Amino acid sequence: VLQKILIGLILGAIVGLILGHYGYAHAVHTYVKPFGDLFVRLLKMLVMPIVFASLVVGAASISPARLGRVGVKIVVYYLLTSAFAVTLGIIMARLFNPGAGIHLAVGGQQFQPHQAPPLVHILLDIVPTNPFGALANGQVLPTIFFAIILGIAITYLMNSENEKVRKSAETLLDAINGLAEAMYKIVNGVMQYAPIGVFALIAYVMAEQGVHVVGELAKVTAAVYVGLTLQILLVYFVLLKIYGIDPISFIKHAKDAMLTAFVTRSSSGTLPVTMRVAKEMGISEGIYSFTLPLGATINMDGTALYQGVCTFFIANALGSHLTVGQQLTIVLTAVLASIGTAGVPGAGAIMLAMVLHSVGLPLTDPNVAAAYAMILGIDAILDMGRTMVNVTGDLTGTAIVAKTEGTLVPR
Amino acid sequence: VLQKILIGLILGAIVGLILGHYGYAHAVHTYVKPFGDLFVRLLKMLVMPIVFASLVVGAASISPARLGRVGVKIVVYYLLTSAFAVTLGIIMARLFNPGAGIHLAVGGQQFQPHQAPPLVHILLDIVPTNPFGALANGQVLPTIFFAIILGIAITYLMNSENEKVRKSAETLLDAINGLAEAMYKIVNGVMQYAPIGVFALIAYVMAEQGVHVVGELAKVTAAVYVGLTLQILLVYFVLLKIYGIDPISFIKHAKDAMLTAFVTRSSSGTLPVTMRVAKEMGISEGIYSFTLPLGATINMDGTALYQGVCTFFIANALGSHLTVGQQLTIVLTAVLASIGTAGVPGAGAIMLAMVLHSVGLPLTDPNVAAAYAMILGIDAILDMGRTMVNVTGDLTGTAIVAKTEGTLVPR
Amino acid sequence: VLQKILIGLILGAIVGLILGHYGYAHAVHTYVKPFGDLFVRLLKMLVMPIVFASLVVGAASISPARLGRVGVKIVVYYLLTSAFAVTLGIIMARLFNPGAGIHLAVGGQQFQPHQAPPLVHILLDIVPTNPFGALANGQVLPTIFFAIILGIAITYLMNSENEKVRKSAETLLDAINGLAEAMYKIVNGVMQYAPIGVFALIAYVMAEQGVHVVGELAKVTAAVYVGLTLQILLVYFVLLKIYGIDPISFIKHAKDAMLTAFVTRSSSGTLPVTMRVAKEMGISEGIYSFTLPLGATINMDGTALYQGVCTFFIANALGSHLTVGQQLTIVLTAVLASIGTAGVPGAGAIMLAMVLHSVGLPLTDPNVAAAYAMILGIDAILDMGRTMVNVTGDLTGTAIVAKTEGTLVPR
Ligand SMILES: CCCCCCCC/C=C\CCCCCCCC(=O)OC[C@H](O)CO
Ligand SMILES: CCCCCCCC/C=C\CCCCCCCC(=O)OC[C@H](O)CO
Ligand SMILES: CCCCCCCC/C=C\CCCCCCCC(=O)OC[C@H](O)CO
Ligand SMILES: CCCCCCCCCCCCCCCCCCCC
Ligand SMILES: CCCCCCCCCCCCCCCCCCCC
Ligand SMILES: CCCCCCCCCCCCCCCCCCCC
Ligand SMILES: CCCCCCCCCCCCCCCCCCCC
Ligand SMILES: CCCCCCCCCCCCCCCCCCCC
Ligand SMILES: CCCCCCCCCCCCCCCCCCCC
Ligand SMILES: CCCCCCCCO[C@@H]1O[C@H](CO)[C@@H](O)[C@H](O)[C@H]1O
Ligand SMILES: CCCCCCCCO[C@@H]1O[C@H](CO)[C@@H](O)[C@H](O)[C@H]1O
Ligand SMILES: CCCCCCCCO[C@@H]1O[C@H](CO)[C@@H](O)[C@H](O)[C@H]1O
Ligand code: NA
Ligand code: NA
Ligand code: NA
Ligand code: NA
Ligand code: NA
Ligand code: NA
C-alpha cells in the first residue's frame, strides 16, 4: 500500500533528523537500521532466481531476431541517456559552483582505487564458463547471457518431432516458470514489510548523514538533486511523451520501484520490484526480463550525473579550473567507464576514479582525497536519489522500447 | 541392519585399542580411517539437497501459521534444554572435580580464537542475499529460510485461477519433491556401508585418542559422559513421557541417527539419517524438515554440557575457583553463545572461547592454553558422545512438538 | 560445416605466421584472439550442465552392474594407453634426441610447483560433501559421482508402488533431460561460430609461438608430434580395428571434437562436442556420459607422451643421462601422476614436476628452470596436439567399450 510506505518515508525522515540532532544516532544505528537492512536482504534474495527464471521464459516466448532488435534499441537508449546525464551534471555544477572556496587540510581517509579490468575481459566475461557458478556468485550479466541461450534452445526443442524431447523441454520450462511466478508472488509479501523497512532505512540515513548536509555539502546535494530532478523531467518525461506514453501514467505504475530504489540504494536489489512494475505495465516478459536486469547493471544515469557534479566539486575544492575540453573528456570517460565496468563489483567507485583521473585529479593525491572524503560524508544521502534515477531510466527505456515493438505475444 | 553397525562399533572399538596399544596407530590412520571418512562424505553429500527439497515440500504442505507455532515451540524447547545441559555440566564438574591438582608447564599449542560476528549480523544472515550461493556454500539457516518462503509461495500459486500458473507451480514442486524422495532413497543405500564406515571411524578414534584417556583426562571423560547420559535420561526421557511418548519406542526409532551421530561426530552430516528417522516415526514433513535442520545447527545440548565441564576443568587446572555467580555467568554465556554463532562455521570453538572469557580464562593465556591443549588430546572421544546428544535432542524436540500438534496432514 | 573450420584452421595458421613474422603479433593478441577466446568460453559454458544432466539420464537408463563393468573396462583402457603414451614419448625422445648440445644461461622465469594432495584425499574428494558446490565450482569428478547416484536413485523411485512418488521422480528426470537436450542443441549453434573461433585461436598461437619453433625447439615439436601421430595410428587405430571398428569411420564421426580440442587446447572445454560426437556415433548415453567426462580429466595420453619427451629434453639440455631404470621410473611416475592429480586444477603442471623430480631434475633447480622455460616458449603449439590426442583417446576407449557391451537400450 502506497500511503503506508510514504508515511514510513516521511515519518522516518523526520524522526531520523530529530534523533540525529540530539546525538541518538548510534541508537538508530543499533536498534533501527537492522529492520531496514532486513528489507534490503529480503529483496536481494529474489534477484538471481527472478532474473534467471524470467529471462528463460521470456527469451523462449519471443523470436531471437526481435530480442536482438530490442537489444540494439535499449543499448542505444542507455548510451544516449547516460551521456545526457553526465552532461547535465556538468551544467548543474557550472550553474551552482559547488566546492568553491573550500581549502581542506590533508589527512584522514586515503584510497587506492581498484583498476577496471580491460574492455575485452569485461566483454568476454558476459559469457559464463560456468552458469551454476554465475548463478551462485550472483553475476547478473553472464546469468542474462545463459538464460537467453537456454530459453532459445528450449523453444527449438519444443518444435521437435520427437514427443519425448518436446515433453522434457516443456517440463524444464514449466519448472523454471514456476520459479519465476513464485518470486513475483514473494515480492508482494515482502512489500507488505516495506513501510517498516522504508522507515528504518531513511531514519538511519537522516540520523547519520542528514546532519552533515550543511555549507558546501548542501550546495553539492542541491546541484545533484536538481540535476536528478531535471533528468526525470527534461529527459525521461519528454522522451516518454514523444513515444506516446503519459508521464503520469508511467509514474503511477513505476512509483513502487522508484520509492524502493530511493531508500534501498540498490539497483540490483530493487530489480524484483522493477520487474513486477513492468509486468503490471503489461510489458512483454520477452522484453523487460532482458532490458531491466541489463539496465540495472550498465545503465546508471543517476551515477553518471553525480560523477559530473563530483568531478567539479573536487576540482573547485583544489582550485582547479576545468576547460571545455576537459568537460568533454569527463562526458566521454563517464560513458566509457560504465561500459568498461559492466559486470564489475564496486563499479561505482572505480568509474569515479577513472573519471577523476581523466582530468588529472587522481584519488591517490592527498588533496583530492581530502576533497573526496568530504563529499563521501553525505554519500548515503546522494546515493538515495541517484540510485532512484538509475532504476527509473531502466523502466523508461523499457517502456519506450516495449512501445516501439507494438503488439507482442508468445509464439 | 542394526546388528551389523553394532558389530562394527564394537569390533572397531576393540581393534582400535589393540592396534593403538602396539603403536600401529599410523597404520590405522593410513589404511583404515579412509573407509570411515568416506561414510561421512557420503552422508554430507545428501545434506543440502535433502534439507532444501524436504522443506519446500513441507512448508507447502502445512499452513504458515502452524509453521510459526511449530517454530516458537521448538525454539523454546531448544533454549530450555540447552540451559539445563550446561547447568548439568557444571553439576557434573562440581561432583567429579576434574582438572584438580594439575600443574601443567606452559608451551606447545597456542590459539587465537575467532570472534563471533555481532548478533544482528548473525540474525540478518538467516536471510540469504543469494539462495543459489547459500545452497552452494552449504549455508543451512539461509537455505531453511528460502526453502520455507519458496514453499509457501508455491502453495499460493497452486490456488491460482490461471491453470497455466497452477501447472507450472505443480511441476516445480514435483521436481523438488522428486529430489527430496531421491535423497531419502540414497540414505538407505549409504547405510548399507555404515558397518564398514562405523568400524573404521571408531577404530581410528580409539587407536589415536583411546590411549590418552588416563589420569585427569579420564575424570573429564567420565564427568562428560555421565553428564551426557543424564541429559538423555533425566531430560529427554522424562520430557518424552510427560508428552505421552514411550522413551523406548523413541530410542527404537531413533537408534540409527544416534549411532551415526556418535561415530560421524557431525550433526550436519547425520541430518539425512535424522530426517529419515523422523519420517519413519511418521512425523509430518511440515515439521521435521524445519525443526531438525534448525536443531542441527543451533541446538547442541551435548556441546553446552561439555562447555560447562570444560570451563571447570580449565579453572581447576589453573587453581581458579568459580563462584556461584560465575557459574551463573557460564550458563547465560553458553546459551547466548549458541544463539550468537548460529550460522557460523567452527562455532563450537568460538562458543567455548566466549564462555571461557566470560569467567576470565582467555584462551590467549599460556596457562589456559596448556590446560585446553590437554583436554583437546581426547576431543574426538568427547566429540562422539556430545555430537550424539546434540542430534538426539533434535529428535526429542521434534517428537514432542509433533505430538502437541496432534493430527496434521497436507492441505 | 567441416569445410569451413578447416578453412579457418588453414587460413588462420598462415595469416598468423605472416603477421607474426612482420611483428604484428600484438595486433593479433589485441584484435583477433578475443574472437577465439569467445569460442572457448561458449563451449566451456555447456560443460557442467551437459555433464550433470546427461549422466543423470544415462545412469538411470542402464543397470548399475553394467555401469560398473563399463567403469572397470574404461579405467583399464585409460591406464594401458597412458602407459604406452609416456613409453612412446621416451622412444620418441631417444630416437630424435631433442635438447642435446644446449648450454642455457641461468636466469629468467623460476617456478615453485604446487604439491599434489595425497592419493587418499584425491580419492575421497570424488565424493562431494556439497553437490551444489561441486556444480558451481565446476568440479567434474564429484559431479560425475553425484549424477550417477542421483540417476540410480531416480530409477528406484520410478519403480515405486506409490504413483505420487513415481510421478515426481519422472518430473525431475524429464526436467534434467530437458536441460541435457538443450545443451546439445546449443552446441550445434556454437559450432556455427567455430570457423571464426578456430581461425582466431590458431592465428594467435602461430603469431605468438609459431616463430619460436626453430633450432632445438623444432626437434622437440617434431618428436612430440610424431609421437602423437604414432599414438593415434599404432595404438587407437590398431585397437579400434581389433575390436571391429573402422578407423576411418571413427575419424569421420570424431573429426569435430578432434579439431575443436586441437585449437581449443581444452579437454574439459571440448567435452560438449566430444559428447555430441559419441551420441552421433549412436553410443549409449549410459556409457559416454560417464566415460567421456572421466577420460577428459584422468585420461591424457597426449600429456603423458609430452611428459616423456619433456623429461628427456630437460635431461639432455643439462647433460644428464637417463638410465633404463630411470626411464622405467618416468613411466610409472607419469601413470601415478595422472591418478594422483585426478580432480586437481592445473594438474598438468604438477604432474610434470612430479615426473621431473622422479629422475632428479627438480624445477626449483635454476638450470632445470632455464631448460623448462625454453620449452614453455612453444607450449601453446605443443598443447594443441597433445590436447587433441587427450580427447581422441577418450572417444576411442568409449567406442571400444560401447562395442564390447553390444546391444544396450534403456530399461
Ligand atoms: C513523497 C514526498 C516526501 C519526500 C520527503 C522524503 C525525505 C527525503 C529526504 C532527503 C532527500 C534529500 C534532501 C536531504 C535532506 C537533508 C536534511 C537537512 O537539510 O538537515 C540539515 C541539518 O538540519 C542542518 O544542520
Ligand atoms: C552398543 C554398546 C557398545 C558400546 C561400546 C562402543 C565403544 C564406545 C567407546 C568409547 C566411549 C567413551 C569411552 C572412552 C573409552 C576409552 C578407552 C580406554 O579407557 O583406554 C585407556 C587405556 O587402555 C589405558 O592406558
Ligand atoms: C587439416 C590439415 C591442415 C593442417 C595444418 C593446420 C596448422 C597446424 C599448425 C601447427 C601444427 C604444429 C606444427 C608447428 C608449425 C610451426 C610453424 C613454423 O615452423 O615456423 C617457423 C618459422 O617460420 C621459422 O623461423
Ligand atoms: C538474427 C539473430 C539475432 C540473435 C540475437 C540473440 C539475442 C540478441 C541480444 C541483443 C544484442 C545487443 C547487444 C546487447 C549486449 C549487452 C551489451 C553489454 C555491454 C557491456
Ligand atoms: C494509483 C494511485 C497512485 C497515486 C499517485 C502516486 C504518485 C506518487 C509519486 C511518487 C513519484 C516519485 C517517488 C519517489 C519519491 C522520492 C523521494 C522524494 C525526495 C526527493
Ligand atoms: C501468521 C503468519 C506467521 C508466518 C510464519 C512463517 C514461518 C514462521 C517461522 C518460525 C518463527 C519462529 C522463529 C524461528 C527462527 C529461528 C531462530 C534462529 C535463532 C538463531
Ligand atoms: C527394532 C529392534 C531394535 C532393537 C533395539 C535397539 C536399541 C539399541 C540401543 C541404542 C541406543 C543408543 C545408541 C548409541 C550408542 C552409543 C555408544 C555407546 C557408548 C556410550
Ligand atoms: C553391482 C553393483 C555395482 C555398482 C556400481 C555403480 C557404478 C560403478 C562405477 C564404476 C566403478 C569403476 C571405478 C571408476 C571410478 C573412477 C576412478 C577415479 C580414479 C582417479
Ligand atoms: C563426412 C565427410 C567428412 C570427410 C572426412 C573428414 C576427415 C578430416 C580429417 C581430420 C582428422 C584429424 C583432424 C585434426 C586435425 C589436426 C591438425 C593437423 C595438424 C597436425
Ligand atoms: C504508462 C505505463 C507504461 C506503458 C508502456 C507501454 C508499452 C506497451 O507494452 C506493450 O503493449 C502491447 C499491447 O498490449 C503488448 O502486446 C506488448 O506485449 C507490450 O510489450
Ligand atoms: C515413539 C516415536 C516418536 C513418535 C512421535 C509422536 C509424534 C506423532 O506425529 C504426528 O502424528 C500424527 C497422527 O498420526 C500425524 O497426523 C502427524 O502428521 C504427526 O506429526
Ligand atoms: C565408427 C564410429 C564408432 C562406432 C562405435 C561402436 C559402438 C556401438 O555402440 C553401441 O551400438 C549398439 C548397437 O546399435 C547400441 O545398441 C548401443 O547402445 C551402443 O552403445
Ligand atoms: Na543511460
Ligand atoms: Na539502471
Ligand atoms: Na537445547
Ligand atoms: Na542438534
Ligand atoms: Na590413457
Ligand atoms: Na582425455
Side-chain angles (χ1 to χ4, degrees), chain A residues 1-2 4-113 115-166 168-180 182-410, chain B residues 1-2 4-113 115-166 168-180 182-410, chain C residues 1-2 4-113 115-166 168-180 182-410:
Chain A
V1 136
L2 226 279
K4 243 154 220 162
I5 65 196
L6 273 185
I7 286 173
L9 177 79
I10 295 214
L11 251 226
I14 65 196
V15 16
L17 285 164
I18 285 165
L19 275 171
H21 176 267
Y22 287 135
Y24 287 26
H26 228 73
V28 175
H29 200 188
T30 288
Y31 293 110
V32 168
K33 185 176 189 280
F35 292 87
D37 302 317
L38 172 50
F39 182 57
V40 166
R41 298 201 112 235
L42 281 172
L43 276 181
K44 276 162 141 89
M45 169 173 69
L46 276 23
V47 166
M48 291 304 303
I50 197 166
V51 158
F52 171 77
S54 277
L55 227 188
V56 171
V57 170
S61 82
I62 83 165
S63 80
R66 249 207 206 265
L67 198 42
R69 198 164 75 227
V70 155
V72 173
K73 277 195 192 181
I74 193 131
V75 157
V76 158
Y77 166 84
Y78 283 159
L79 248 20
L80 292 192
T81 54
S82 280
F84 202 97
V86 59
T87 296
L88 192 57
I90 304 315
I91 288 171
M92 226 44 34
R94 297 235 276 144
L95 174 81
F96 283 109
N97 188 225
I102 301 191
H103 300 280
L104 290 193
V106 130
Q109 175 173 14
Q110 54 202 235
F111 341 65
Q112 342 71 335
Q115 327 138 129
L119 181 59
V120 157
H121 214 279
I122 270 156
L123 267 26
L124 248 29
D125 287 345
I126 293 182
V127 178
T129 57
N130 188 358
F132 294 121
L135 264 178
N137 293 320
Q139 301 168 136
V140 174
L141 286 218
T143 290
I144 286 179
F145 184 81
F146 173 75
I148 292 193
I149 303 313
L150 169 60
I152 290 165
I154 286 181
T155 276
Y156 279 78
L157 280 180
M158 283 194 297
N159 284 349
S160 178
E161 46 158 345
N162 302 329
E163 196 268 318
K164 205 217 196 220
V165 163
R166 244 149 46 228
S168 59
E170 275 146 35
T171 312
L172 179 62
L173 190 51
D174 283 49
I176 292 173
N177 183 50
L179 177 60
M183 291 304 112
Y184 284 98
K185 212 19 110 60
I186 287 162
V187 173
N188 298 346
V190 164
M191 284 313 284
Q192 301 293 295
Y193 174 82
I196 302 165
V198 159
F199 166 87
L201 278 155
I202 184 85
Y204 166 66
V205 167
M206 285 304 144
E208 279 272 279
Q209 293 195 12
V211 188
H212 283 207
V213 184
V214 292
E216 217 61 23
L217 278 194
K219 267 220 213 167
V220 168
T221 313
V224 168
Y225 263 82
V226 172
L228 294 176
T229 301
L230 241 44
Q231 255 279 319
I232 296 183
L233 300 178
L234 286 202
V235 182
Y236 302 159
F237 277 14
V238 173
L239 275 179
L240 283 179
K241 222 279 145 36
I242 285 169
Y243 283 97
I245 305 181
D246 180 274
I248 298 297
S249 292
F250 168 87
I251 293 303
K252 259 244 275 158
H253 282 297
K255 76 222 164 189
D256 279 301
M258 299 189 64
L259 267 157
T260 289
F262 181 75
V263 298
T264 266
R265 287 168 278 126
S266 188
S267 280
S268 169
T270 300
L271 214 34
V273 182
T274 317
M275 291 186 67
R276 180 186 79 172
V277 156
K279 186 193 201 190
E280 284 167 349
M281 290 182 175
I283 295 171
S284 169
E285 196 169 28
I287 296 195
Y288 72 67
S289 81
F290 165 68
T291 56
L292 281 186
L294 182 67
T297 83
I298 78 163
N299 181 62
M300 295 158 297
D301 289 358
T303 306
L305 184 142
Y306 162 77
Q307 289 175 354
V309 174
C310 183
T311 296
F312 261 75
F313 165 91
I314 292 175
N316 286 349
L318 263 43
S320 277
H321 169 254
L322 294 184
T323 73
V324 162
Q326 291 186 280
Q327 276 158 245
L328 214 259
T329 286
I330 296 180
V331 166
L332 249 193
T333 309
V335 165
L336 268 38
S338 88
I339 293 160
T341 65
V344 171
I350 294 169
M351 286 193 276
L352 211 222
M354 293 180 40
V355 185
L356 282 173
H357 203 219
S358 69
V359 287
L361 300 156
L363 277 179
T364 53
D365 183 326
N367 296 306
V368 171
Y372 185 40
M374 189 167 167
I375 196 171
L376 265 196
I378 61 154
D379 186 69
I381 292 268
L382 267 29
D383 193 24
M384 277 185 318
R386 75 179 182 240
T387 296
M388 179 230 275
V389 167
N390 283 356
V391 169
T392 300
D394 302 339
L395 280 168
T396 300
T398 299
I400 275 158
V401 169
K403 182 73 170 188
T404 74
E405 284 300 318
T407 289
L408 175 50
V409 287
Chain B
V1 136
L2 226 279
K4 243 154 220 162
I5 65 196
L6 273 185
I7 286 173
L9 177 79
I10 295 214
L11 251 226
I14 65 196
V15 16
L17 285 164
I18 285 165
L19 275 171
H21 176 267
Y22 287 135
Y24 287 26
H26 228 73
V28 175
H29 200 188
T30 288
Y31 293 110
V32 168
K33 185 176 189 280
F35 292 87
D37 302 317
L38 172 50
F39 182 57
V40 166
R41 298 201 112 235
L42 281 172
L43 276 181
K44 276 162 141 89
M45 169 173 69
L46 276 23
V47 166
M48 291 304 303
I50 197 166
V51 158
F52 171 77
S54 277
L55 227 188
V56 171
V57 170
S61 82
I62 83 165
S63 80
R66 249 207 206 265
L67 198 42
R69 198 164 75 227
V70 155
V72 173
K73 277 195 192 181
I74 193 131
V75 157
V76 158
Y77 166 84
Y78 283 159
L79 248 20
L80 292 192
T81 54
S82 280
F84 202 97
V86 59
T87 296
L88 192 57
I90 304 315
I91 288 171
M92 226 44 34
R94 297 235 276 144
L95 174 81
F96 283 109
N97 188 225
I102 301 191
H103 300 280
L104 290 193
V106 130
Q109 175 173 14
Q110 54 202 235
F111 341 65
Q112 342 71 335
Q115 327 138 129
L119 181 59
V120 157
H121 214 279
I122 270 156
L123 267 26
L124 248 29
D125 287 345
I126 293 182
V127 178
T129 57
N130 188 358
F132 294 121
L135 264 178
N137 293 320
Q139 301 168 136
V140 174
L141 286 218
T143 290
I144 286 179
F145 184 81
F146 173 75
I148 292 193
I149 303 313
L150 169 60
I152 290 165
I154 286 181
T155 276
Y156 279 78
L157 280 180
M158 283 194 297
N159 284 349
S160 178
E161 46 158 345
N162 302 329
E163 196 268 318
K164 205 217 196 220
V165 163
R166 244 149 46 228
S168 59
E170 275 146 35
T171 312
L172 179 62
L173 190 51
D174 283 49
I176 292 173
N177 183 50
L179 177 60
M183 291 304 112
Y184 284 98
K185 212 19 110 60
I186 287 162
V187 173
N188 298 346
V190 164
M191 284 313 284
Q192 301 293 295
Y193 174 82
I196 302 165
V198 159
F199 166 87
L201 278 155
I202 184 85
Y204 166 66
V205 167
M206 285 304 144
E208 279 272 279
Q209 293 195 12
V211 188
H212 283 207
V213 184
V214 292
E216 217 61 23
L217 278 194
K219 267 220 213 167
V220 168
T221 313
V224 168
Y225 263 82
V226 172
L228 294 176
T229 301
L230 241 44
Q231 255 279 319
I232 296 183
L233 300 178
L234 286 202
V235 182
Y236 302 159
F237 277 14
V238 173
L239 275 179
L240 283 179
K241 222 279 145 36
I242 285 169
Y243 283 97
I245 305 181
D246 180 274
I248 298 297
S249 292
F250 168 87
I251 293 303
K252 259 244 275 158
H253 282 297
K255 76 222 164 189
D256 279 301
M258 299 189 64
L259 267 157
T260 289
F262 181 75
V263 298
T264 266
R265 287 168 278 126
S266 188
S267 280
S268 169
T270 300
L271 214 34
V273 182
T274 317
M275 291 186 67
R276 180 186 79 172
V277 156
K279 186 193 201 190
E280 284 167 349
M281 290 182 175
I283 295 171
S284 169
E285 196 169 28
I287 296 195
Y288 72 67
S289 81
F290 165 68
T291 56
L292 281 186
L294 182 67
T297 83
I298 78 163
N299 181 62
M300 295 158 297
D301 289 358
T303 306
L305 184 142
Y306 162 77
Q307 289 175 354
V309 174
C310 183
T311 296
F312 261 75
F313 165 91
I314 292 175
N316 286 349
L318 263 43
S320 277
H321 169 254
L322 294 184
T323 73
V324 162
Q326 291 186 280
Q327 276 158 245
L328 214 259
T329 286
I330 296 180
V331 166
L332 249 193
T333 309
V335 165
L336 268 38
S338 88
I339 293 160
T341 65
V344 171
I350 294 169
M351 286 193 276
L352 211 222
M354 293 180 40
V355 185
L356 282 173
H357 203 219
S358 69
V359 287
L361 300 156
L363 277 179
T364 53
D365 183 326
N367 296 306
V368 171
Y372 185 40
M374 189 167 167
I375 196 171
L376 265 196
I378 61 154
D379 186 69
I381 292 268
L382 267 29
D383 193 24
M384 277 185 318
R386 75 179 182 240
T387 296
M388 179 230 275
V389 167
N390 283 356
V391 169
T392 300
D394 302 339
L395 280 168
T396 300
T398 299
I400 275 158
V401 169
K403 182 73 170 188
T404 74
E405 284 300 318
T407 289
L408 175 50
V409 287
Chain C
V1 136
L2 226 279
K4 243 154 220 162
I5 65 196
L6 273 185
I7 286 173
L9 177 79
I10 295 214
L11 251 226
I14 65 195
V15 16
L17 285 164
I18 285 165
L19 275 171
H21 176 267
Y22 287 135
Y24 287 26
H26 228 73
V28 175
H29 200 188
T30 288
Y31 293 110
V32 168
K33 185 176 189 280
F35 292 87
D37 302 317
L38 172 50
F39 182 57
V40 166
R41 298 201 112 235
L42 281 172
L43 276 181
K44 276 162 141 89
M45 169 173 69
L46 276 23
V47 166
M48 291 304 303
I50 197 166
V51 158
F52 171 77
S54 277
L55 227 188
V56 171
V57 170
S61 82
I62 83 165
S63 80
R66 249 207 206 265
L67 198 42
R69 198 164 75 227
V70 155
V72 173
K73 277 195 192 181
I74 193 131
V75 157
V76 158
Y77 166 84
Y78 283 159
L79 248 20
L80 292 192
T81 54
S82 280
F84 202 97
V86 59
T87 296
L88 192 57
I90 304 315
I91 288 171
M92 226 44 34
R94 297 235 276 144
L95 174 81
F96 283 109
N97 188 225
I102 301 191
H103 300 280
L104 290 193
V106 130
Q109 175 173 14
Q110 54 202 235
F111 341 65
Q112 342 71 335
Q115 327 138 129
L119 181 59
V120 157
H121 214 279
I122 270 156
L123 267 26
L124 248 29
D125 287 345
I126 293 182
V127 178
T129 57
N130 188 358
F132 294 121
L135 264 178
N137 293 320
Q139 302 168 136
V140 174
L141 286 218
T143 290
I144 286 179
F145 184 81
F146 173 75
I148 292 193
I149 303 313
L150 169 60
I152 290 165
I154 286 181
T155 276
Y156 279 78
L157 280 180
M158 283 194 297
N159 284 349
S160 178
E161 46 158 345
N162 302 329
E163 196 268 318
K164 205 217 196 220
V165 163
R166 244 149 46 228
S168 59
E170 275 146 35
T171 312
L172 179 62
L173 190 51
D174 283 49
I176 292 173
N177 183 50
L179 177 60
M183 291 304 112
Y184 284 98
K185 212 19 110 60
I186 287 162
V187 173
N188 298 346
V190 164
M191 284 313 284
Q192 301 293 295
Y193 174 82
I196 302 165
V198 159
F199 166 87
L201 278 155
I202 184 85
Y204 166 66
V205 167
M206 285 304 144
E208 279 272 279
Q209 293 195 12
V211 188
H212 283 207
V213 184
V214 292
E216 217 61 23
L217 278 194
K219 267 220 213 167
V220 168
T221 313
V224 168
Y225 263 82
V226 172
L228 294 176
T229 301
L230 241 44
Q231 255 279 319
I232 296 183
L233 300 178
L234 286 202
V235 182
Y236 302 159
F237 277 14
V238 173
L239 275 179
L240 283 179
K241 222 279 145 36
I242 285 169
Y243 283 97
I245 305 181
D246 180 274
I248 298 297
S249 292
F250 168 87
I251 293 303
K252 259 244 275 158
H253 282 297
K255 76 222 164 189
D256 279 301
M258 299 189 64
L259 267 157
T260 289
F262 181 75
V263 298
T264 266
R265 287 168 278 126
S266 188
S267 280
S268 169
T270 300
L271 214 34
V273 182
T274 317
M275 291 186 67
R276 180 186 79 172
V277 156
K279 186 193 201 190
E280 284 167 349
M281 290 182 175
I283 295 171
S284 169
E285 196 169 28
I287 296 195
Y288 72 67
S289 81
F290 165 68
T291 56
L292 281 186
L294 182 67
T297 83
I298 78 163
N299 181 62
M300 295 158 297
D301 289 358
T303 306
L305 184 142
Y306 162 77
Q307 289 175 354
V309 174
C310 183
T311 296
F312 261 75
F313 165 91
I314 292 175
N316 286 349
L318 263 43
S320 277
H321 169 254
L322 294 184
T323 73
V324 162
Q326 291 186 280
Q327 276 158 245
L328 214 259
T329 286
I330 296 180
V331 166
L332 249 193
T333 309
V335 165
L336 268 38
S338 88
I339 293 160
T341 65
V344 171
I350 294 169
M351 286 193 276
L352 211 222
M354 293 180 40
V355 185
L356 282 173
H357 203 219
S358 69
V359 287
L361 300 156
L363 277 179
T364 53
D365 183 326
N367 296 306
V368 171
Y372 185 40
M374 189 167 167
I375 196 171
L376 265 196
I378 61 154
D379 186 69
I381 292 268
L382 267 29
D383 193 24
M384 277 185 318
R386 75 179 182 240
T387 296
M388 179 230 275
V389 167
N390 283 356
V391 169
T392 300
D394 302 339
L395 280 168
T396 300
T398 299
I400 275 158
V401 169
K403 182 73 170 188
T404 74
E405 284 300 318
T407 289
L408 175 50
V409 287

